[PDB]
Structures are given as structure tokens and as C-alpha cells.
PDB file of C-alpha atoms and ligand atoms in Angstrom:
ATOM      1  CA  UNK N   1       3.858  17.982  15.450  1.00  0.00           C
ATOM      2  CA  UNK N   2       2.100  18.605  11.894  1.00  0.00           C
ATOM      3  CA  UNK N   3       5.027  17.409  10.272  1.00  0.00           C
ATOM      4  CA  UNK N   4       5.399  13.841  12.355  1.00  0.00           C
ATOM      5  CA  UNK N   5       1.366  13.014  12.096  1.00  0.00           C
ATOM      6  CA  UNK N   6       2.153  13.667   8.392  1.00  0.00           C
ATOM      7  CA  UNK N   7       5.262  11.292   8.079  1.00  0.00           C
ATOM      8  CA  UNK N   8       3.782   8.473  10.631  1.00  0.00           C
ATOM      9  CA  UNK N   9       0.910   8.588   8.209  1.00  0.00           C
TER      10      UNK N   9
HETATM   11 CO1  LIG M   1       3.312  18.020   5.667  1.00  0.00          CO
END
């Protein structure tokens, strides 16, 4: 999950 909040973003 911390990984794909930090690409969407
Ligand atoms: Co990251």
C-alpha cells in the first residue's frame, strides 16, 4: 500500500 499512495501521488 505505501508504495501505490506514493506512485498515485
Ligand atoms: Co516510496
Amino acid at each position: 500500500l505505501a508504495e501505490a499512495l506514493h506512485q498515485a501521488l
